[PDB]
Design a protein around this motif. Structure first.
Motif, PDB file in Angstrom:
ATOM      1  N   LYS B  29       0.821  -1.208   0.000  1.00  0.00           N
ATOM      2  CA  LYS B  29       0.000   0.000   0.000  1.00  0.00           C
ATOM      3  C   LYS B  29       0.855   1.259   0.000  1.00  0.00           C
ATOM      4  O   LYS B  29       0.420   2.305  -0.493  1.00  0.00           O
ATOM      5  N   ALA B  30       2.063   1.183   0.558  1.00  0.00           N
ATOM      6  CA  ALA B  30       2.942   2.347   0.623  1.00  0.00           C
ATOM      7  C   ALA B  30       3.434   2.811  -0.741  1.00  0.00           C
ATOM      8  O   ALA B  30       4.004   3.902  -0.832  1.00  0.00           O
ATOM      9  N   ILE B  31       3.250   2.013  -1.793  1.00  0.00           N
ATOM     10  CA  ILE B  31       3.706   2.408  -3.124  1.00  0.00           C
ATOM     11  C   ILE B  31       2.880   3.574  -3.653  1.00  0.00           C
ATOM     12  O   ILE B  31       3.413   4.496  -4.278  1.00  0.00           O
ATOM     13  N   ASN B  32       1.576   3.558  -3.411  1.00  0.00           N
ATOM     14  CA  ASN B  32       0.671   4.599  -3.895  1.00  0.00           C
ATOM     15  C   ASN B  32       0.803   5.914  -3.142  1.00  0.00           C
ATOM     16  O   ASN B  32      -0.017   6.805  -3.383  1.00  0.00           O
ATOM     17  N   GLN B  33       1.773   6.090  -2.246  1.00  0.00           N
ATOM     18  CA  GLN B  33       1.876   7.338  -1.500  1.00  0.00           C
ATOM     19  C   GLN B  33       2.376   8.488  -2.361  1.00  0.00           C
ATOM     20  O   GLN B  33       2.020   9.644  -2.108  1.00  0.00           O
ATOM     21  N   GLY B  34       3.203   8.203  -3.368  1.00  0.00           N
ATOM     22  CA  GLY B  34       3.720   9.269  -4.210  1.00  0.00           C
ATOM     23  C   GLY B  34       2.647   9.945  -5.044  1.00  0.00           C
ATOM     24  O   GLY B  34       2.625  11.171  -5.167  1.00  0.00           O
ATOM     25  N   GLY B  35       1.745   9.159  -5.624  1.00  0.00           N
ATOM     26  CA  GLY B  35       0.704   9.687  -6.478  1.00  0.00           C
ATOM     27  C   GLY B  35       0.995   9.665  -7.961  1.00  0.00           C
ATOM     28  O   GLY B  35       0.264  10.306  -8.723  1.00  0.00           O
ATOM     29  N   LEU B  36       2.029   8.954  -8.396  1.00  0.00           N
ATOM     30  CA  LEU B  36       2.416   8.889  -9.797  1.00  0.00           C
ATOM     31  C   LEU B  36       2.180   7.489 -10.351  1.00  0.00           C
ATOM     32  O   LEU B  36       1.938   6.532  -9.613  1.00  0.00           O
ATOM     33  N   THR B  37       2.255   7.381 -11.676  1.00  0.00           N
ATOM     34  CA  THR B  37       2.012   6.128 -12.377  1.00  0.00           C
ATOM     35  C   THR B  37       3.082   5.938 -13.443  1.00  0.00           C
ATOM     36  O   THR B  37       3.566   6.906 -14.034  1.00  0.00           O
ATOM     37  N   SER B  38       3.456   4.681 -13.681  1.00  0.00           N
ATOM     38  CA  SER B  38       4.470   4.335 -14.663  1.00  0.00           C
ATOM     39  C   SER B  38       3.938   3.256 -15.595  1.00  0.00           C
ATOM     40  O   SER B  38       3.157   2.395 -15.187  1.00  0.00           O
ATOM     41  N   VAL B  39       4.367   3.315 -16.854  1.00  0.00           N
ATOM     42  CA  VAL B  39       3.945   2.364 -17.878  1.00  0.00           C
ATOM     43  C   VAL B  39       5.165   1.944 -18.683  1.00  0.00           C
ATOM     44  O   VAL B  39       5.952   2.795 -19.111  1.00  0.00           O
ATOM     45  N   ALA B  40       5.327   0.639 -18.891  1.00  0.00           N
ATOM     46  CA  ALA B  40       6.414   0.101 -19.699  1.00  0.00           C
ATOM     47  C   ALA B  40       5.835  -0.786 -20.789  1.00  0.00           C
ATOM     48  O   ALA B  40       4.999  -1.650 -20.509  1.00  0.00           O
ATOM     49  N   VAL B  41       6.276  -0.575 -22.026  1.00  0.00           N
ATOM     50  CA  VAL B  41       5.790  -1.323 -23.179  1.00  0.00           C
ATOM     51  C   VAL B  41       6.981  -1.881 -23.943  1.00  0.00           C
ATOM     52  O   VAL B  41       7.981  -1.186 -24.144  1.00  0.00           O
ATOM     53  N   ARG B  42       6.871  -3.135 -24.368  1.00  0.00           N
ATOM     54  CA  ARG B  42       7.906  -3.808 -25.139  1.00  0.00           C
ATOM     55  C   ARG B  42       7.464  -3.935 -26.589  1.00  0.00           C
ATOM     56  O   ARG B  42       6.360  -4.414 -26.864  1.00  0.00           O
ATOM     57  N   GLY B  43       8.328  -3.511 -27.510  1.00  0.00           N
ATOM     58  CA  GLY B  43       8.053  -3.579 -28.924  1.00  0.00           C
ATOM     59  C   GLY B  43       8.783  -4.719 -29.608  1.00  0.00           C
ATOM     60  O   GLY B  43       9.387  -5.586 -28.975  1.00  0.00           O
ATOM     61  N   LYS B  44       8.709  -4.709 -30.940  1.00  0.00           N
ATOM     62  CA  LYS B  44       9.399  -5.730 -31.720  1.00  0.00           C
ATOM     63  C   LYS B  44      10.910  -5.613 -31.575  1.00  0.00           C
ATOM     64  O   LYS B  44      11.611  -6.625 -31.484  1.00  0.00           O
ATOM     65  N   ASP B  45      11.430  -4.383 -31.558  1.00  0.00           N
ATOM     66  CA  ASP B  45      12.865  -4.161 -31.459  1.00  0.00           C
ATOM     67  C   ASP B  45      13.197  -3.005 -30.524  1.00  0.00           C
ATOM     68  O   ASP B  45      14.246  -2.372 -30.671  1.00  0.00           O
ATOM     69  N   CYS B  46      12.326  -2.713 -29.562  1.00  0.00           N
ATOM     70  CA  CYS B  46      12.550  -1.583 -28.672  1.00  0.00           C
ATOM     71  C   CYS B  46      11.774  -1.793 -27.380  1.00  0.00           C
ATOM     72  O   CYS B  46      10.882  -2.638 -27.296  1.00  0.00           O
ATOM     73  N   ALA B  47      12.142  -1.012 -26.366  1.00  0.00           N
ATOM     74  CA  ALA B  47      11.441  -0.973 -25.092  1.00  0.00           C
ATOM     75  C   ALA B  47      11.378   0.472 -24.623  1.00  0.00           C
ATOM     76  O   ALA B  47      12.353   1.212 -24.756  1.00  0.00           O
ATOM     77  N   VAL B  48      10.229   0.873 -24.083  1.00  0.00           N
ATOM     78  CA  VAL B  48       9.957   2.266 -23.747  1.00  0.00           C
ATOM     79  C   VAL B  48       9.441   2.353 -22.317  1.00  0.00           C
ATOM     80  O   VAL B  48       8.672   1.495 -21.873  1.00  0.00           O
ATOM     81  N   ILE B  49       9.870   3.388 -21.597  1.00  0.00           N
ATOM     82  CA  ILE B  49       9.399   3.678 -20.248  1.00  0.00           C
ATOM     83  C   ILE B  49       8.831   5.090 -20.231  1.00  0.00           C
ATOM     84  O   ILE B  49       9.490   6.030 -20.685  1.00  0.00           O
ATOM     85  N   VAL B  50       7.615   5.239 -19.708  1.00  0.00           N
ATOM     86  CA  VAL B  50       6.943   6.530 -19.607  1.00  0.00           C
ATOM     87  C   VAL B  50       6.459   6.718 -18.176  1.00  0.00           C
ATOM     88  O   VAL B  50       5.923   5.787 -17.569  1.00  0.00           O
TER      89      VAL B  50
END
Lengths: 232, 243, 48, 273, 247, 240, 242, 233, 249
Positions: B29-50
């Motif tokens: 539960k302590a993870i949600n204290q910051g209030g931010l969200t992260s998303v990671a997606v894997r492509g055919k030849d790349c990986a992205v973090i937002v």
């Protein structure tokens, strides 16, 4: 009374240890797993918690090999399972180095249980919340064992553990035979796993591994699908 | 040690009558204290973090506020949760990667790094002196025989490999959106991966983004080194998405 | 406006609100369970 | 407190319920013997016999004065009872952890010229389970309509509740608490609100308030709880009231007696320098 | 009462160790074990608890262990602690043999293990072993012997004793059916069968519910063997025939 | 009423961000007897008031000796004072042995504070319940320092600690502007007059309850007790 | 409400909070206010130093330390913890210089000290620190830099900061300055004016202003403001108060 | 309250845990020791007898060296550790000094070992008390007693264990110089002292007799019955 | 016994008695202070007994200068005849073996005076809850079998949770003080009684008292249903002690 339910190193006035019972309760609330010993092999089956499309099939597996002839499956907590698997592999390698021959199943079970017993007698730690099923093949004779969080191990012929395991045990009692074969054992294992399943079983949400004289092998998803289609 | 608190809820090494540890759940539960969200997606030849970037004050220096780190020359990271715990775990990961390289003569793989971190983190769950860290780590990288890789570990000590994961407050909605997209189709190029990663966060938070409100880090097969995109490139991607 | 219970005299390293160590005072009180001894110092000698 | 690594400990409770919630003939006999060990006995020291009747029931009373603590008894001995003839009537015997024998005493006097004036010099400590026995054996069951009671005691300055720091207060100072039926007015400000007082003087005030008897209690908050000259000199303004107006005759000789007795103090344990 | 139960290092107002008492109480749930001393051998009979239909039989025995060329033991309590104690006993015997080039005497081995068991009831932070032991063996100083140990760390030598569930009735019957100086191995076996039959009220005895071990001296050597189901069935049949003839 | 849970250890913060055990330990200083320390342009003077258990016992000593140019005075517990004195002596001895120079008072007091801060943060310890007054002389001239149980130290020009030291502090504040010009005489007299304000108005200062310690430009640390104090007490007035 | 879960630094509240760290952060607001402003070519500090009594010297119990030849420091909260952290910072700077032979960058020093502070909020054998502090430095190849560290162990870069009892009003006053286009000589007066405005005389009897900068004027060195400039700044602030 | 930790003082200055530990001594079997001029006698009464037991393994009288003996009353498992440590120390003393050990020396060692376990909260004291007899190098008989708190002091005749006050009173009344004239008289005195609590002699009594310049000797039921008959005559 | 504050004691026929219990956190006592302060009840007498540690102070519900100086003792009785209510307040702690006699005397007085119902506010330890009790509301209640059927009808309509029973079934209330004894004796003597309690821990217990008062108001309807609802007494100040020493921060 709740006066003896908090500390690990305290005996109840009736001569009972309560935290170990609670660890056993933790074990009995995980995903089901089944092991059946046939006439010429052993089969292990289990569910998997992922059950999603975003999971990567090559990342993490529940049925793992210790040696060329030993494998195991668990029911309970996973982080506690990984450390025990690593220790078991190390012990097997040490035995091979000293004696120049592969370790028998009974010795490995004894040593793993001895390791697990140490955490149930000292204040400042907690017992392992996991239970193990070990299969092997030595001197042309299959073996099947189960190890408790207490450090006590039994030799079985067919057992179930995890969610809804009493019904699995009575199902196995009703339909177990001493002169079975490997294919019949695999079919029975799939059926007794389906008994406690809730959704639609596919080849992507169960794991099956077998152990015969050739060695310990983990079945590929295509083979699992072919077996599932056989029984419909 | 000054003893252990009494109760089915107030210590790490005490099992509940139903057989479950509650301090680990509270750490989750302590993870949600910051209030931010992260998303990671894997492509055919790349990986992205937002991830999000919130700068509340006006006397703050926006250059020093970041959540994307760098473990080795070819491994990225993103942290969610308590800032100090995130930084401490990042330092530990750097040390472990360096030690592996020295001991074995080649670069540590992403799954090996994640497994090492998880194995270390499990020990805090079985001893009365230490407490879990309230953060989760997502790593990206490129393997030799295999392509991109995305991994995640949690305070309980459990790690797994994914195709598209998320963490934070909007984890469930992000997971549903990514599940729909992946089930529809997965063959993506470099441009498509960034576009869908941005679109997921945009449509979940219901916010029209600005170039200074997000930060992106990518890894590609052509250039396997972790790289953090700049404001101009983020704005170009946003304009292309809008058009 | 309630009366409650407070304890400070069960540890060697605890200070009372008025800066008193109570375990040392109790150890001193433990002397009164012994036998009486008298010592007189004089310019000619010492008596015990 | 934990005695070994990882011991399970419980938090203390300020309501005191953690001990009495647990409610063989040997145990009952042990309990009876322990209860008999710490009973309150009032006896006449002249012949070493107990008084079967309450002390105030035998003798009529018009004024009663009680002093608790070393400073209060020293003040009364030096200033009041140095100019008359007082006869001892009885004494009390107690036992508990903090008063092993009965420096520790509780002696009652009454004036020879006026037998309706009494005194009490209690320097011992009466435990929480012996105060009601004390009240029963001193006052009895049926009180008297016309009787005035004055009480004196000392308290440490760190027990005072104030918004500022404790050390900033100009100790010592006097405070008062009087019952509803006390028509007169005190010579010091009444005690502030969030502050309370407990133990034996509180018991006497509760008795007097319930049974409609005039009474007043005087408190001295000081930074030195031993036998000190400043603390006992802080009680001087009380002598101007009607309760002590007709009992003081010579101030300089009382001061000389106070100085003389200040040089025969008890030996303090050499913990502090 | 409930105030002096927290740990092993607290004395009750009348000098009692409640934690050790509770640990000794923990033994009353395990299976029943027996030991009878005869003129030409010693005996050890135990009750099988693992009787589920799906269990396997892989091991040499379930409760009987071999410690030495001249000794054996039986456990009752927690299996996890029993395993550790058995391993330590074997190590101690081998150490003495290496030191002195002679097999260790039974009383010395028992004392060495009981010291270890007692060490856990004195240092706080640990938990005492909840196991009781029965030892049999042969020795050149005193011949056949039979000992018993309990979680407190105490021990003593007996001629016929019993531990585990329903121990009091078995002891009471032994105290009136054992005759000193005139017991042979067959008489001891018959007495053990009768006592087990009386103390097991679950059902009628069957050869798969008990296991019997016999230690005898044969031509300068000590032989330890476990009786088989054929012999057990013959013994039970003979006892039943004797009871039938009794009425 | 609500404080009972957060005032049993030094490792627990109160909900108002206060450590109550440090404040409790600071109250042990007021259990001793009054001490006065002042300084001038050349000399540094310590004056202390001694108590006795009874008429047949020697008065407890309050002024100790640390080095040829440093001396201390004690108000509070006794074991802590002894331990701190041992530490001071060892540090001075080591510095002199290694560098062939006296150890500066500022460095010494910094070491004291650094050592004393530790037991107020870790478990299984209690703060030092003692307050000190330090007088020394080095290249920068005379120095007067004060130490607190909370591991805090101040650089003073005239200070008083102990029981009922407010009167002494008031007198020192009133007469602060004349200290820097007085020689040793009238400086010891100012100290004695300041110390006399902590007594009841009836009694005075005798030769059996005062101690004096002086350190100066070319005079080492010396302690005057019993008959050695009469010359300083000859010229005092009749407590105006 | 976190009653029952706030007696150790290794306990999680049911909503995922550690309350001992929160109490430690609350403890900082019991001391006076210190501010620091970063400008075009330097950093200047200012501390409102209360006076306890007239018996103390001029330089007693200061609140501005010299961590290194090029780094300053200002503290707030418990003083003993501030001395301990100053010693730690000095040791870190000395160790880096000895190992690598040149002056330690400010960001690295801030990271080291912040991690050391954070390490205390993990175990039950110690307690969290009760003080905040700021660091400032200047160099020709990097420029002015300012950082803050709090008891939880979080560090950030700032253009203008304020810690202590009255940080809110101080921040409001700072937010009205164009510090990016001014010079230290024009920032000393503003710092003094803000300190004088924030100070409350009803609950605080008297105070002494304390100032120090680092920048191009001092040639990359941290120094105390000369007395005449302090007097001029104080006079200007007093005039601006009217 | 104040009776749960070993190192906590009561408000009146009492260490209650050690007193509770001593309370465990008052439940064991009675032990009696009498010092003569050329003989020392120890007597222990059997609390109960089980017919199906070996009496050799339940003895409460032990030999520490050639000229020292010992008898205890309390916790049986705790007594064995102390006995073994004392034996090792007795043998180790001769390696440093050629002379044999002295009764006071060995009593001091035992008392110090007992006291070492009452200094911390991490371990509990020994709940036993002992009687030590023997002969010195020059030939002087001795008799000492030890307590769980760690105190020792000499005696002429003493009794410990349950029902010890009556035995001590009897010994005080019946001890004199003409009663220890000979070995038979001393042995009969010990038997008479033990007979005050034992319900029937001969079956619930065991004696150990040590003479000067001789080893320990354990009397047998035949001799015990003979002495009982002579006393009853 | 009940000693009147004037000359003759009033009548309490058909009144409802509200009392606290000396439990963990003093939640019942705080709730009683809130109720007395809000409803503005007037003292009518005392309850003198030798079962509580004596204590004395000035008026804790002072609102003006005239009434700010009125002595108080450890047990006082207030009433409000308009609403037929009466309240008891205890400001001390019990002596070792004087709990059951006090309960007996109090119940005898309740039976003799002529009251109708009794309501008791207390609390229990919050660390002894199992998994099922960690997922539910922290408020519980109990009733006696002799209670009027309308009361159980209303309680069932209110959708409340009843206290769980344990097997030796028996009622066990850890940390409740005299609540169990009062309940058992009331069942024995056939007196209508209700118990309301909360799971609390020791510390700052003002929100717990406010919540318990609101929980009671949902049934008794003291105020209109829904910050300014309850009037904080002036005595609730300096709860954490005095001020800071000067030279620490």
């Amino acid at each position: 009374e709740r006066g003896y339910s908090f500390s690990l190193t305290t005996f109840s006035p009736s001569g009972k240890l309560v935290q170990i019972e609670y660890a056993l309760a933790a074990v009995a609330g995980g995903a089901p797993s089944v092991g059946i010993k046939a006439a010429n092999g052993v089969v292990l089956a289990t569910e998997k918690k992922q059950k999603s499309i975003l999971y990567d099939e090559r990342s993490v597996h529940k049925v793992e090999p210790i040696t060329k002839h030993i494998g195991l499956v668990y029911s309970g907590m996973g982080p506690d399972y990984r450390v025990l698997v690593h220790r078991a592999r190390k012990l097997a390698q040490q035995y091979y180095l000293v004696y120049q021959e592969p370790i028998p199943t009974a010795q490995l079970v004894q040593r793993v249980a001895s390791v697990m017993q140490e955490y149930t007698q000292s204040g400042g730690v907690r017992p392992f919340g996991v239970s193990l099923l070990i299969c092997g093949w030595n001197e042309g004779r299959p073996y099947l064992f189960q190890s408790d969080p207490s450090g006590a191990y039994f030799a079985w012929k067919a057992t179930a553990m995890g969610k809804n395991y009493v019904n699995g045990k009575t199902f196995l009692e009703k339909r177990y035979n001493e002169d079975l074969e490997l294919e019949d054992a695999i079919h029975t294992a799939i059926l007794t796993l389906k008994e406690s399943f809730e959704g639609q079983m596919t080849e992507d949400n169960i794991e099956v591994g077998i152990c015969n004289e050739a060695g310990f092998r983990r079945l590929t998803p295509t083979e699992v699908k072919d077996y599932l289609a056989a029984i419909a | 040690s000054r003893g252990s608190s009494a109760g089915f809820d107030r210590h790490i090494t005490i099992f509940s009558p139903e057989g479950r540890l509650y301090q680990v759940e509270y750490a989750f539960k302590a993870i949600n204290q910051g209030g931010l969200t992260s998303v990671a997606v894997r492509g055919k030849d790349c990986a992205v973090i937002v991830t999000q970037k919130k700068v509340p004050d006006k006397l703050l220096d926006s250059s020093t506020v970041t959540h994307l780190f760098k473990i080795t020359e070819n491994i990225g990271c993103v942290m969610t949760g308590m800032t100090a715990d995130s930084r401490s775990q990042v330092q530990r990961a750097r040390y472990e990667a360096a030690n592996w390289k020295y001991k074995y003569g080649y670069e540590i793989p992403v799954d090996m790094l994640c497994k090492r971190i998880a194995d270390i983190s499990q020990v805090y769950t079985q001893n009365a002196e230490m407490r879990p860290l309230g953060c989760c780590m997502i790593l990206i990288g490129i393997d030799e025989e295999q392509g991109p890789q995305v991994y995640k570990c949690d305070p309980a000590g459990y790690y797994c490999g994914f195709k598209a994961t998320a963490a934070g407050v909007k984890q469930t909605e992000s997971t549903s959106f990514l599940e729909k997209k992946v089930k529809k189709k997965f063959d993506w190029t470099f441009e498509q991966t960034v576009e869908t990663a941005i679109t997921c966060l945009s449509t979940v938070l219901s916010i029209d983004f600005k170039p200074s409100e997000i930060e992106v880090g990518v890894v590609t097969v052509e250039n396997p080194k972790f790289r953090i995109l700049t404001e101009a490139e983020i704005d170009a991607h946003l304009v292309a998405l809008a058009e | 406006m309630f009366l409650t219970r407070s304890e400070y005299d069960r540890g060697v390293n605890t200070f009372s609100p008025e800066g008193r160590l109570f375990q040392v005072e109790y150890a001193i009180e433990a002397i009164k369970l012994g036998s009486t001894a008298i010592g007189i110092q004089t310019s000619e000698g010492v008596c015990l | 407190a934990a005695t070994f690594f990882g011991e399970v400990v419980k938090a203390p409770c300020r309501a005191g319920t953690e001990d009495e919630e647990e409610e063989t003939p040997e145990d009952r006999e042990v309990r009876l013997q322990l209860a008999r060990k710490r009973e309150v006995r009032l006896l006449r020291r002249q012949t070493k016999t107990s008084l079967e009747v309450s002390l105030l029931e035998k003798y009529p009373c018009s004024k009663f004065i009680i002093a608790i603590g070393n400073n209060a008894v020293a003040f009364l001995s030096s200033f009041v009872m140095n100019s008359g003839v007082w006869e001892e009537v009885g004494c009390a015997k107690l036992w508990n952890e903090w008063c092993r024998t009965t420096e520790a005493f509780c002696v009652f006097y009454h004036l020879k010229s006026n037998p309706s004036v009494f005194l009490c010099q209690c320097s011992c400590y009466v435990a929480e389970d012996q105060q009601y026995q004390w009240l029963e054996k001193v006052f009895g069951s049926c009180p008297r309509k016309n009787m005035q009671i004055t009480i004196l005691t000392c308290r440490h300055v760190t027990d005072y509740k104030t918004s500022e720091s404790t050390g900033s207060l100009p100790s010592p100072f006097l405070r008062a608490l009087k019952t509803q039926n006390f028509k007169d007015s005190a010579c010091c400000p009444l005690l502030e609100q969030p502050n309370i007082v407990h133990d034996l003087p509180a018991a006497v005030l509760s008795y007097c308030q319930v049974w409609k008897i005039p009474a007043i209690l005087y408190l001295c908050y000081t930074d030195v709880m031993k036998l000190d000259l400043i603390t006992v000199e802080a009680f001087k303004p009380i002598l101007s009231t009607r309760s002590l107006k007709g009992l003081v005759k010579n101030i300089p000789q009382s001061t000389e007696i106070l100085k003389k007795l200040m040089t025969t103090n008890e030996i303090q344990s050499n913990i502090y320098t | 009462s409930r105030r002096y139960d927290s740990r092993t290092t607290i004395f009750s107002p009348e000098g009692r160790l409640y934690q050790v008492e509770y640990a000794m109480e923990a033994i009353g749930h395990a299976g029943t074990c027996l030991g009878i001393l005869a003129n030409d051998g010693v005996l050890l009979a135990a009750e099988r608890r693992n009787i589920h239909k799906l269990l396997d039989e892989v091991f040499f025995s379930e409760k009987i262990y071999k410690l030495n060329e001249d000794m054996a033991c039986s456990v009752a309590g927690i299996t996890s602690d029993a395993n550790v104690l058995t391993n330590e006993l074997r190590l101690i015997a081998q150490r003495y043999l290496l030191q002195y080039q002679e097999p260790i005497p039974c009383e010395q081995l028992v004392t060495a293990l009981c010291d270890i068991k007692q060490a856990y009831t004195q240092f706080g932070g640990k938990r005492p072993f909840g196991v009781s032991l029965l030892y049999i063996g042969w020795d050149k100083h005193y011949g056949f012997q039979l000992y018993q140990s309990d979680p407190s760390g105490n021990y003593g030598g007996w001629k016929a004793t019993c531990i585990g569930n329903n121990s009091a009735a078995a002891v009471s019957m032994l105290k009136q059916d054992y005759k000193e100086g005139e017991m042979t191995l067959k008489s001891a076996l018959a007495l053990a069968i009768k006592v087990l039959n009386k103390t097991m009220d679950v059902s009628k005895l069957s050869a798969e519910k008990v296991e019997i071990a016999t230690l005898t001296r044969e031509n300068g050597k000590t032989v330890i063997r476990v009786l088989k189901q054929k012999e057990v069935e013959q013994l039970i049949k003979k006892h039943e025939e004797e009871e039938a003839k009794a009425e | 009423m609500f404080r009972n849970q957060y005032d049993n250890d030094v490792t627990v913060w109160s909900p108002q961000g206060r450590i109550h055990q440090i404040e409790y330990a600071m109250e042990a200083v007021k259990q001793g007897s009054a001490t006065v320390g002042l300084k001038s342009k050349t000399h540094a003077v310590l004056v202390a008031l001694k108590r006795a258990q009874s008429e047949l016992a020697a008065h407890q000593k309050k002024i100790l000796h640390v080095d040829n140019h440093i001396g201390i005075s004690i108000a509070g517990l006794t074991a802590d004072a002894r331990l701190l004195c041992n530490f001071m002596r060892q540090e001075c001895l080591d510095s002199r042995f290694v560098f062939d120079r006296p150890l500066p008072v500022s460095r010494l007091v910094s070491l004291i504070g650094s050592k004393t801060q530790i037991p107020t943060q870790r478990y299984g310890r209690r703060p030092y319940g003692v307050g000190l007054l330090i007088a020394g002389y080095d290249d920068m001239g005379p120095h007067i320092f004060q130490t607190c149980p909370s591991a805090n130290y101040f650089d003073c020009r005239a200070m008083s600690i102990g029981a009922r030291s407010q009167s002494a502090r008031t007198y020192l504040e009133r007469h602060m502007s004349e200290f820097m010009e007085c020689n040793l005489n009238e400086l010891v007299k100012h100290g004695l007059r300041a110390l006399r304000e902590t007594l009841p108005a009836e009694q005075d200062l005798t030769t059996k309850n005062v101690s004096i310690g002086i350190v100066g430009k070319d005079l080492e640390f010396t302690i005057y007790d019993d008959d050695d104090v009469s010359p300083f007490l000859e010229g005092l007035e009749e407590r105006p | 409400i976190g009653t029952g879960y706030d007696l150790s630094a290794s306990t999680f509240s049911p909503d995922g909070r550690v309350f001992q760290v929160e109490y430690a952060m609350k403890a900082v607001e019991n001391s006076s206010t210190a501010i620091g402003i970063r400008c075009k070519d330097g950093v200047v500090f200012g501390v409102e130093k209360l006076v306890l009594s007239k018996l103390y010297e001029e330089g007693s119990n200061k609140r501005l330390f010299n961590v290194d030849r090029h780094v300053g420091m200002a503290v707030a909260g418990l003083l003993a913890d501030a001395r301990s952290l100053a010693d730690i910072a000095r040791e870190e700077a000395s160790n880096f210089r000895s190992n690598f032979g040149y002056n330690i960058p400010l960001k690295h020093l801030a990271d080291r000290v912040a991690m050391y502070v954070h390490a205390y909020t993990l175990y039950s054998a110690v307690r969290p620190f009760g003080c905040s502090f700021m660091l400032g430095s200047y160099s020709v190849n990097d420029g002015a830099q300012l950082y803050m560290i709090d008891p939880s162990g979080v560090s950030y870069g700032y253009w203008g900061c304020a810690i202590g009892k009255a940080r809110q009003a101080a921040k409001t006053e700072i937010e009205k300055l164009q510090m990016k286009e001014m010079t230290c000589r024009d920032i000393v007066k503003e710092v003094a004016k803000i300190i004088y405005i924030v100070h409350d005389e009803v609950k605080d009897k008297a105070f002494e202003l304390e100032l120090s900068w680092v920048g191009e004027l001092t040639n990359g060195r941290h120094e105390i403001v000369p007395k005449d400039i302090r007097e001029e700044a104080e006079k200007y602030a007093k005039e601006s108060l009217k | 309250s104040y009776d749960r930790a070993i190192t906590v003082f009561s408000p009146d200055g009492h260490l209650f845990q050690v007193e509770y530990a001593q309370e465990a001594v008052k439940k064991g079997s009675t032990a009696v020791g009498v010092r003569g001029r050329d003989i020392v006698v120890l007597g222990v009464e059997k609390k109960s007898v089980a017919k199906l037991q070996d009496e050799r393994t339940v003895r409460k009288i032990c030999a520490l060296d050639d000229n020292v003996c010992m008898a205890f009353a309390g916790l049986t498992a705790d007594a064995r550790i102390v006995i073994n440590r004392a034996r090792v120390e007795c043998q180790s003393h001769r390696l440093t000094v050629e002379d044999p050990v002295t009764v006071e020396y060995i009593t001091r060692y035992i008392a110090s070992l007992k006291q070492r376990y009452t200094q911390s909260n991490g371990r509990r004291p020994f709940g036993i008390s002992a009687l030590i007899v023997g002969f010195d190098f020059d030939g002087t008989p001795r008799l000492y007693q030890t307590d769980p708190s760690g105190t020792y002091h000499a005696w002429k005749a003493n009794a410990i264990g349950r029902g010890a006050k009556s035995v001590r009173e009897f010994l005080e009344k019946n001890y004199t110089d003409e009663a220890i004239e000979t070995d038979d008289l001393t042995i009969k005195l010990v038997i008479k002292a033990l007979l005050e609590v034992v319900q029937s002699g001969g079956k619930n009594i065991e004696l150990a007799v040590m003479r000067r310049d001789q080893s320990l000797k354990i009397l047998n039921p035949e001799e015990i019955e003979k002495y009982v008959a002579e006393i009853e005559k | 016994m009940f000693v009147p504050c004037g000359e003759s004691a009033p009548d309490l026929a058909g009144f409802t008695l509200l009392m606290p219990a000396v439990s963990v956190g003093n939640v019942g006592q705080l709730a009683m202070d809130l109720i007395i302060s809000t409803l503005n009840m007037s003292k009518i007498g005392y309850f003198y007994t030798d079962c509580l540690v004596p204590m004395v102070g000035n008026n804790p519900y002072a609102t003006t200068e005239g009434n700010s100086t009125e002595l108080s003792i450890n047990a006082e009785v207030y009433s409000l005849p308009s609403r037929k209510l009466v309240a008891l307040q205890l400001r001390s702690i019990f002596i070792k073996y004087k709990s059951k006699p006090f309960c007996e005397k109090l119940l005898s007085w309740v039976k003799s005076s002529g009251c109708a119902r009794v309501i008791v506010l207390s609390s229990s330890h919050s660390y002894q809850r199992n998994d099922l009790q960690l997922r539910s509301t922290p408020f519980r209640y109990l009733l006696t079998p002799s209670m009027q059927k309308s009361v159980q009808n209303k309680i069932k309509s209110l959708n409340w949770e009843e206290m769980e029973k344990s097997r030796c079934f028996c009622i066990r209330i850890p940390g409740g003080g005299i609540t169990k004894t009062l309940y058992d004796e009331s069942c024995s003597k056939e007196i209508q009684m209700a118990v309301l309690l909360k799971f609390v821990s020791e510390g700052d217990n003002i929100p717990d008292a406010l919540g318990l008062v609101e929980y009671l108001n949902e049934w008794l309807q003291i105020l209109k249903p829904l910050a300014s609802r309850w009037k904080i007494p002036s005595s609730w100040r300096l709860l954490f002690g005095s001020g800071l020493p000067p030279a620490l921060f």
